[model samples]
Target chain A: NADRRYKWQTVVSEQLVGAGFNEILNNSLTAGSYYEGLKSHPREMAVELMNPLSQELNCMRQTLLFGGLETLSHNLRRKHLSLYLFEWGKCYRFHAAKRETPLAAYAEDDRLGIWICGQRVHPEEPTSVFELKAVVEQVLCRVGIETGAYTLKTADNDLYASAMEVKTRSGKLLGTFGTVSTELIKRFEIEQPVYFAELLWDALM
Target chain B: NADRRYKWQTVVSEQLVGAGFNEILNNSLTAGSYYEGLKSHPREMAVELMNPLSQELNCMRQTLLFGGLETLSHNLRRKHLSLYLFEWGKCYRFHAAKRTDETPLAAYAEDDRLGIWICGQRVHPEEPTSVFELKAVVEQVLCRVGIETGAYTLKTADNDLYASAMEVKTRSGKLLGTFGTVSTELIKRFEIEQPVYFAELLWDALM
Candidate 1:
């Protein structure tokens, strides 16, 4: 019904999948390889990236959480460092006041991952890693996200994570999002030299 | 204050006087000269007949006692025998429904006369006396006085007043004074030429 309601949903879905595959291919390849596959096999890369998840979920999270994420992404993307940012937010629910069942009032948190290609510089030229961290901090403050900075490390995935917890006045956990793993990024066909995040308001509450 | 309320009040008062005279002089006059005033000087006669009585007795009288004298004069003027017939009645007076210092009683009673009239007439064309005519005379005079016509009642009885006469009463069961025609012997003494009648009721039954 929503696909019918907004025909642009198809357009946005195709664009996201296309962009995701392009990011996956570019991210997985070394500096000198048969890089022509990135441009030649774009559609195949899109399918490979988004095989399990339907285009609907991709479109739902993007449209619903587009405003804040876009602002954050635009600011971080300007720096051209692999952008790492995450946000958890509760969408304003229309029938939140009329909930007869307790569970219907629960907030859904969203996770987002974004990356932009690092700025091109001479091979001898050096950039401070903390310079990228500072950019994330600046964008987070601009977007009114006040949270702790932590790193997540495990055997399967180690991530340089910038995370935030979102809640309502009644102290309901919304969701979480941050960079996960390169394998995971490739799987999702996200091409922008991007960071990632996830959300679990359901699990926390 | 009432005069200021309506000009029609004055008009209605004049109308009442005119109607009173009209009924008394014309409509009220029967075949006999007893109503000669109607044929002669009706307006003057009505005034003359009414003036002294109206002045002396300003209050309204409903029965034969006070009314009987007026009845007698009306019939006597015709050379008809005047009579007294019997009646029973009760008098009335206005009383305030609510208690006040001015009036302690629950209701006020008035001077009502309960009595009858008696008179005689010529018994027959040759005999010169009539008990029936006497009764009729009494009834006519009472009617003129505006005692309600339907209030009269007739009955046969052994009484000192008449061979047979009526016993009159009001709707409230109070007896009006009674009167009727005298016998021939009485009529002869009075020099009566025609049948005479009488009516009597309580003197002031409404009092």
Candidate 2:
């Protein structure tokens, strides 16, 4: 799993660093350098630190092609822990427009963000919403954003109790967040109780 | 002079009115129902009424050649009427960038744009600029699009403005477009002092 995970993480990290975010890569982020961290480490630390929070992902998998959930679930069961896993990658498509001009033709490329939250080791006490927020904040802190930059609030419809909106300099909504929908969890058949959030970035441009 | 100018003007006007402003020929336009008049009658009347404005032009020249200035000086002895004129058109190139890869690649074909403006008719009777000289300068306005004459292979053809017309073609046998003098009847029809100047561009299949 480390080999496969490291390979994917390396590609993501290289892309981020190549775009000039050394502060996030090095984890030397601070309040004054927060924007640099956020820009550089949007998804950088999730792979690295999430393993410590979820020990079920300690070993390398024999095959990487099986669904991440099944592999992670089997591996976690063997380790006597619940599986908490997520994977993000690029999505591609061709000819998505209606009025197709020969000159106006284009291919679509978009980003994918995935996250999984589950029990750390014990099953008796489910991970509290506060505990999940702490881990998420810690991961974000590693990138460069400070706790004060965004405001968090709770809503009833989400799997996670709280959602957040990251703001821009001009006070425009950059993106929104809530718990991953329960329907999605059911679709993935993630047996253990977990919370998830996915966000696309905006603002600088 | 008038007959030849009229014939060229009529030919070019028909070609342009039939082809120029149509939806198929034009790209990057938002469709709307705001018309000044109906299509056929309005367009025909517009061209007919524009006759005088077209004849003031006689040639396409981006710069006033020294010979033309000398001829104007001699012509001043016979003509006393002062005049002014104006015209606009587009210019183009096949490969403008040295590094084709550096430029953003798009599937769009020929890129034509309105190019230059020539105006020299005196605003007042006591002004120094003569109408004929101003009309000649108007022709050069088309050259501003960076398509230099003789720089590309060219074919001459009649246009709504020029008597001695030209259609620029790229070395690869692509039609870059046309320009020349306006018709005398067009100048007379518009009741202007001289013929008009003009140029146009038609793009080719793009890679």
lDDT of 2 by residue, A41-158 (tens): 2222221111121233212111111133343344445563433333232221122235534422222122223233455443365544454355445434444557676555443433
Candidate 1 DockQ category?
incorrect
DockQ for candidate 2: 0.01
Assess each prediction's global lDDT (C-alpha) against the native.
Answer: 0.33, 0.32
Q: For each model, chain A TM-score?
A: 0.30, 0.43
- Model 2: residue A77 alpha-carbon error in angstroms: 7.0
Give stretches of model 2 more than 4 Å off. Answer: A1-80, A86-88, A92-114, A121-123, A153-163, A169-177, A199-205, B1-207
TM-scores of the models, in the given order?
A: 0.20, 0.27
Report chain B TM per candidate.
0.32, 0.33
Which digits, one per residue and each the tens of the lDDT, describe model 2 over residues B1-207?
222332332333333223221100111111111112323112111111111112322111222211122222333334734322111111111223445676432221123233221223344344444324322322232243344445565576644344555666666776665555544543343344543444444422111
Give the per-residue lDDT of model 1 (tens digit) for B99-120: 5755433343333243333334
Error of 1 at B207 (Å): 4.9
Considering every candidate listed, which one attains the maximal TM-score? Answer: 2
The lDDT of model 2 is: 0.32
